[PDB]
Amino acid sequence: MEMEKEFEQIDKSGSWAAIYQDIRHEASDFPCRVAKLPKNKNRNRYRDVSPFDHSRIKLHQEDNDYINASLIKMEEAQRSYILTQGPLPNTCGHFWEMVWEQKSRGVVMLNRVMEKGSLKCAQYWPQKEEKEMIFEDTNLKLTLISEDIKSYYTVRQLELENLTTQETREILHFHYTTWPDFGVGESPASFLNFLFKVRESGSLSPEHGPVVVHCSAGIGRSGTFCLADTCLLLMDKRKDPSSVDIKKVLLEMRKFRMGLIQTADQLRFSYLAVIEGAKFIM
Numbered sequence: 556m557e558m559e560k561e562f563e564q565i566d567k568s569g570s571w572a573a574i575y576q577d578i579r580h581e582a583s584d585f586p587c588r589v590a591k592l593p594k595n596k597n598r599n600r601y602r603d604v605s606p607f608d609h610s611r612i613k614l615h616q617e618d619n620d621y622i623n624a625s626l627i628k629m630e631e632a633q634r635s636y637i638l639t640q641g642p643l644p645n646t647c648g649h650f651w652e653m654v655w656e657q658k659s660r661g662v663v664m665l666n667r668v669m670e671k672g673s674l675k676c677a678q679y680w681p682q683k684e685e686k687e688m689i690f691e692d693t694n695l696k697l698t699l700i701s702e703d704i705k706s707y708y709t710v711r712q713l714e715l716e717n718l719t720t721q722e723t724r725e726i727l728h729f730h731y732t733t734w735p736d737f738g739v740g741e742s743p744a745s746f747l748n749f750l751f752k753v754r755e756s757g758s759l760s761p762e763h764g765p766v767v768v769h770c771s772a773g774i775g776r777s778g779t780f781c782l783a784d785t786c787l788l789l790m791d792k793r794k795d796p797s798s799v800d801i802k803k804v805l806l807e808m809r810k811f812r813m814g815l816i817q818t819a820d821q822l823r824f825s826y827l828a829v830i831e832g833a834k835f836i837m
């Protein structure tokens with residue numbers, strides 16, 4: 556609406572880089588003391604991407620509670636997300652332990668395991684039904700039950716079993732497999748359709764623990780996904796639906812995890828997605 560004209564003004568004035576750098580400058584700065592402890596060095600994929608102490612997810616088993624993951628609690632929009640890095644070969648057990656302990660129903664993956672020939676995320680789920688994964692450190696078993704592969708994303712039904720209690724849970728794995736190789740997409744259509752499929756699944760509902768969202772570092776594409784989702788919620792909730800200020804929402808989110816949205820293009824793409832998505836919900 557008005558937001559759509561604000562978008563055009565930024566585009567003609569070429570102000571995207573300027574707006575994005577204002578966000579980085581105004582962003583919250585809270586301590587990440589635990590993330591930076593010597594014993595956690597090999598639980599961080601990127602030394603420059605750490606959870607704040609105040610919002611980090613704590614693992615419940617006995618020896619080291621640390622995982623590189625943040626609870627993002629959007630109060631007005633009434634939605635919570637856990638944003639986390641793509642797990643490492645040694646933190647896959649921690650990752651599924653977090654999913655169990657936080658009672659998550661869905662996992663949203665926004666990257667491929669390898670991109671431009673670099674390892675961005677461990678193969679943390681089973682690719683074959685008959686080859687289940689056992690995480691001996693956290694005593695969990697994970698089985699591929701079935702998968703629905705579409706052109707722009709794949710949804711997998713996973714069975715997560717607490718080998719301690721033999722309780723099992725169905726986890727939905729929403730894998731957006733087609734984020735553009737460089738930059739962002741020309742159109743937000745495919746990303747928006749993926750978002751709506753996650754919503755339709757029930758994985759985001761408050762009856763469940765927060766959805767777990769990750770990319771490689773858990774801040775760039777992950778930030779895009781949560782920012783768009785939250786802004787679209789706010790546009791549907793408010794009686795003044797164009798009072799939604801995307802920059803303000805992003806700064807609110809950045810109180811809970813650093814660095815959400817990593818490029819001016821991703822900020823532009825987020826605006827595009829919220830604009831076109833708000834029209835879809837109409």
Ligand SMILES: O=C(O)C(=O)Nc1sc2c(c1C(=O)O)CCNC2
Nearest residue numbers: 601603770771772773774775776777
């Ligand atoms: O996957 C994403 O969208 C994301 O946040 N990626 C990020 S953020 C980020 C890095 C990466 C990476 O993948 O190399 C490396 C250096 N520090 C910041």
Ligand SMILES: [Cl-]
Nearest residue numbers: 592593594595
């Ligand atoms: Cl230490």
Ligand SMILES: [Cl-]
Nearest residue numbers: 666667668669
């Ligand atoms: Cl992959």
Ligand SMILES: [Cl-]
Nearest residue numbers: 754755759788
């Ligand atoms: Cl929803």
Ligand SMILES: [Cl-]
Nearest residue numbers: 798799800803
């Ligand atoms: Cl706002």
Ligand SMILES: [Cl-]
Nearest residue numbers: 579814815817
């Ligand atoms: Cl940043």
